[PDB]
């Protein structure tokens, strides 16, 4: 198979406005929303329909029990670094875990936290420690690292625990996670730069570059953002300035699950 | 199903060794705890794991293997006071709690 | 200090009468549990409390319910004993759920038997 990941988010905000949730928490397979839960509707709930077809509803209300549980640890964590940083005002607090099954059977595993959007601890479950980016982080960090069982449990639920819920998730979207659509390709020419542009594929990882005379040019290149189409499919592009005193054969290159695509301009 | 298996009852003598085996059978693997229970009293806990190897706490050392699935607490210079129920129980893919039967330990003076 | 504080230590009943278990915790913990144990099998969990404002039926939940009054306290209701809930009920607790490596602190058990 291609590489694949699953992810869980979690976001709280200390003050927030009227309506808006102060405890959210997502979960991704690579690009897929497939679960979803906020302090609003105190309720875990799927976000991708192979997700609600292959999960009894035992899982979704033992996972909501869980969830509402880390909804009120992590306003008390929260709590406790606001007081630290001695902040007024409403601030966020994140955190990300999760775990890739890479295209040759390898497998990594991360969980960091965010204060404000900003990188906060870093867990490393090979060293079995917290990196610790200021001085209230490094206080958090003694108090974890003082809970050995717990960085031990992270480490087992990292490598193999999220490794299994990944392949189970996999195997319920295989439709979806595991099928092909090539890019259309085309370019055009807009004033003057050569545009080359791939939409309707899937999946959104895909590498377009422009090559002169047959050797790549990075820093002339104007890369464009994988957006999605939303019909699930997405679209990207690349540019390139034209040098208007001297011909060179331009040619975009795409490459896309396995297969290279060359568009020589004439 | 899930299940968790344990000696129902193990008998050593005072001053010895004993090895208190537990096996499981469970959907996801979260860790395993040991818990001693005297007679009539509550439960208290003793240990955990959750990756390989055996880890010591005085007199009393737990070992786990996740590939075979197996566990046992292993009690030296055994006392008249370790006379009690051991329970060994595991943490599922779900975090819920599965408990085995117990294995009650009678010491010989 | 106390620990985990369940109440009452024994209690006969008759078929039908209704029976309330009182616990409580002073570990400042968010999770309380209440279980069952019977000879020649492992604990059961009735019901539990993942934190304060929230309650789940566990794997026996039948004849049972709970009301997790405050972060302290979460008492187990019978309201119409049957013979099969002659047990020893223990009530615990733990500082969170939903983690690994978290142990349970139990109380010191209620021993009920019903009669008809």
């Known amino acids: 198979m291609r590489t694949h990941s699953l992810r869980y988010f979690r976001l709280g905000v200390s003050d927030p406005i009227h309506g808006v949730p102060e405890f959210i928490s997502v979960g991704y397979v690579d690009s897929h929303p497939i679960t979803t839960y906020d302090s609003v509707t105190r309720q875990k709930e799927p976000r991708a329909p192979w997700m609600a077809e292959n999960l009894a509803p035992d899982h979704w209300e033992r996972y909501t029990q869980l969830l509402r549980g880390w909804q009120q640890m992590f306003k008390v964590e929260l709590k406790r670094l606001q007081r630290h940083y001695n902040h007024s005002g409403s601030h966020t607090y994140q955190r990300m875990i999760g775990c890739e099954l890479l295209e040759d059977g390898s497998t990594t595993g991360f969980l960091q936290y965010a204060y404000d959007g900003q990188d906060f601890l870093i867990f490393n479950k090979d060293t079995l420690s917290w990196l610790a980016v200021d001085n209230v982080a490094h206080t958090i960090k003694q108090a974890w690292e003082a809970n050995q069982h717990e960085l031990l449990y992270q480490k087992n639920w990292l490598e193999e625990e999220c490794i299994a819920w990944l392949k189970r998730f996999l195997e319920y979207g295989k439709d979806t996670l595991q099928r092909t659509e090539p890019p259309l390709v085309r370019v055009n020419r807009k004033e003057t730069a050569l545009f080359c542009k791939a939409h309707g594929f899937y999946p959104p990882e895909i590498y377009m570059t422009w090559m002169k005379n047959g050797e790549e040019i990075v820093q002339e290149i104007d890369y464009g953002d994988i957006l999605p189409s939303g019909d699930g499919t997405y679209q990207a592009w690349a540019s390139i300035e034209l040098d208007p005193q001297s011909s060179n054969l331009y040619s975009c290159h795409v490459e896309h699950s396995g297969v290279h695509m060359v568009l020589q301009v004439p | 199903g899930q299940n968790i298996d344990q000696p129902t009852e193990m008998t050593a003598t005072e001053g010895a060794i004993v090895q208190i085996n537990c096996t499981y059978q469970?959907?996801?693997?979260?860790?395993l705890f040991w818990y001693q229970q005297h007679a009539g009293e509550a439960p208290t806990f003793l240990s955990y794991?959750?990756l390989d190897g055996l880890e010591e706490k005085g007199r009393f050392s737990s070992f786990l293997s996740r590939s075979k699935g197996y566990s046992y607490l292993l009690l030296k210079e055994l006392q008249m006071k370790d006379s009690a129920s051991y329970l060994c129980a595991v943490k599922d893919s779900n975090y819920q709690l599965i408990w085995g039967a117990g294995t009650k330990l009678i010491i010989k003076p | 200090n106390a620990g985990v504080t369940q109440t009452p230590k024994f209690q006969v009943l008759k078929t039908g009468q209704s029976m309330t278990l009182q616990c409580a915790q002073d570990m400042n913990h968010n999770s309380m549990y209440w279980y069952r144990q019977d000879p020649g099998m492992g604990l059961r969990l009735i019901y539990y409390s993942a934190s304060e404002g929230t309650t789940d039926k566990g794997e026996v939940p039948n004849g049972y319910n709970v009301s997790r009054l405050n972060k302290r306290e979460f008492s187990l209701r019978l309201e119409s004993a049957a013979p099969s809930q002659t047990s020893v009920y223990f009530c615990a607790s733990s500082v969170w759920t939903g983690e690994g490596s978290g142990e349970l602190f139990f109380g010191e058990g209620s021993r009920l038997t019903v009669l008809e």
């Open positions: 469970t959907s996801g693997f979260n860790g």
């Open positions: 794991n959750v």
